[PDB]
Amino acid sequence: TLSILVAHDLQRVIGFENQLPWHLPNDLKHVKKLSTGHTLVMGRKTFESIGKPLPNRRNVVLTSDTSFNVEGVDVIHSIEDIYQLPGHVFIFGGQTLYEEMIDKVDDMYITVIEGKFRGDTFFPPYTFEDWEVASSVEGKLDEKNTIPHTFLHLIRK
Numbered sequence: 001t002l003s004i005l006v007a008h009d010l011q012r013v014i015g016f017e018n019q020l021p022w023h024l025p026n027d028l029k030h031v032k033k034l035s036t037g038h039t040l041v042m043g044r045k046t047f048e049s050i051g052k053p054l055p056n057r058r059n060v061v062l063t064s065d066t067s068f069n070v071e072g073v074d075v076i077h078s079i080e081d082i083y084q085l086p087g088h089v090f091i092f093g094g095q096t097l098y099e100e101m102i103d104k105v106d107d108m109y110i111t112v113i114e115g116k117f118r119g120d121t122f123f124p125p126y127t128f129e130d131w132e133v134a135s136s137v138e139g140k141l142d143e144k145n146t147i148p149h150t151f152l153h154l155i156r157k
């Protein structure tokens, strides 16, 4: 299964200056729950924004860099390589990889952040005309989670 896993705001912002623009522990838990024991695929820039692989799952980085080597990370050098990865594979970022993959994936796990943040990195436009809403669940507003947010699971029609 090939899925997108992303959090974006009302204008599809996903990042600003190598950071997540918002602080949402609930969404980090969501990522942990979905991707633990599976595979994350990310572009080089996305990986370097975290600096280390996430524990208890396969971490795959796409780069043209033939020297690229990080403990706990498996490297791939083309998009075609993604289709040979076994199991449930989640496309994890960033803008470039999402642009390359959005027309290819089976489904998308999207956290909609109900705010408007300053951004420099964007999720590509998409229409609900092409995507069925399998589930839509409101996140809990909290002491530690102060931005309204919704977990969507969208399946390609």
Ligand SMILES: NC(=O)C1=CN([C@H]2O[C@H](COP(=O)(O)OP(=O)(O)OC[C@H]3O[C@@H](n4cnc5c(N)ncnc54)[C@H](OP(=O)(O)O)[C@@H]3O)[C@@H](O)[C@H]2O)C=CC1
Binding pocket: 014, 015, 016, 017, 018, 019, 020, 042, 043, 044, 045, 046, 047, 049, 062, 063, 064, 065, 077, 078, 079, 092, 093, 094, 095, 096, 097, 098, 100, 121
């Ligand atoms: N929410 C998120 O996903 C976040 C993402 N980001 C980031 O994304 C921002 C914008 O950069 P963006 O380009 O979208 O980042 P990406 O994570 O998509 O990384 C792009 C890089 O991935 C590699 N790559 C992509 N496609 C291919 C391909 N077909 N073949 C070989 N290599 C490929 C290249 O690495 P190389 O140049 O090494 O060859 C390319 O420069 C960055 O500023 C970074 O911080 C920032 C914050 C949050």
Ligand SMILES: COc1cc(C(C)(C)C#Cc2c(C)nc(N)nc2N)cc(OC)c1OC
Binding pocket: 005, 006, 007, 018, 019, 020, 027, 028, 030, 031, 046, 047, 049, 050, 091, 092, 093, 109, 110, 111
């Ligand atoms: C998992 O934590 C981070 C993830 C990320 C990335 C960009 C790899 C991501 C993501 C992501 C999140 C947070 N939520 C959802 N739903 N999908 C994603 N791809 C960047 C970070 O800092 C810049 C993170 O904090 C260390």
